[PDB]
Amino acid sequence: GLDFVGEDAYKQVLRLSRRLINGDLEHQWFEESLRQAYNNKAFKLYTID
DNA sequence: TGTCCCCCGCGTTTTAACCGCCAAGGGGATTACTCCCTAGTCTCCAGGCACGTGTCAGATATATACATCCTGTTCTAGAGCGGCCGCC
């Protein structure tokens, strides 16, 4: 369920940051989703927690 | 005994070693279900062991023959000496 289709990207990355701070996201998957979601442009949110 | 060049003691400046802190995510450790194969017999039989023996490669033997090592003699190169020549 890390895909972004059928949902606004901003609310989705907000929820992703919530579970990212929550410590149950397996970080590499989170930066991979950011890479294939915003075409590598969201590199500043890797250390949001 | 000498030497000289190879290694030690020390000054200086980097450098990565140890420590403080942080997550991670493969991975060690534990628990459980289950499934194969190894524990344990019965019977037997075909390979393995004790016995017996003809035999074929190794050892003894000795003149012959290697075979290299030690030594003697000769060849040739090197240093010393002496005679001859030119110069002051």
UniProtKB/Swiss-Prot annotation:
Q: What else is known?
A: Present with 1660 molecules/cell in log phase SD medium.
Task: Describe its partners and assembly state.
Answer: Component of the RPD3C(L) complex composed of at least ASH1, CTI6, DEP1, PHO23, RPD3, RXT2, RXT3, SAP30, SDS3, SIN3, UME1 and UME6. Component of the RPD3C(S) complex composed of at least EAF3, RCO1, RPD3, SIN3, and UME1. Interacts with ESS1 and STB1.
**Residue window of the full protein shown:** 1195 to 1243 of 1536
Species of provenance: Saccharomyces cerevisiae (strain ATCC 204508 / S288c)
Functional note: Catalytic component of the RPD3 histone deacetylase complexes RPD3C(L) and RPD3C(S) responsible for the deacetylation of lysine residues on the N-terminal part of the core histones (H2A, H2B, H3 and H4). Histone deacetylation gives a tag for epigenetic repression and plays an important role in transcriptional regulation, cell cycle progression and developmental events. SIN3 also has a RPD3 independent function required for normal longevity.
- Got any disulfides in this one, which pairs? none
This chain is encoded by the gene named SIN3
Where does the record place it?
A: Nucleus
Q: What is this protein called?
A: Transcriptional regulatory protein SIN3
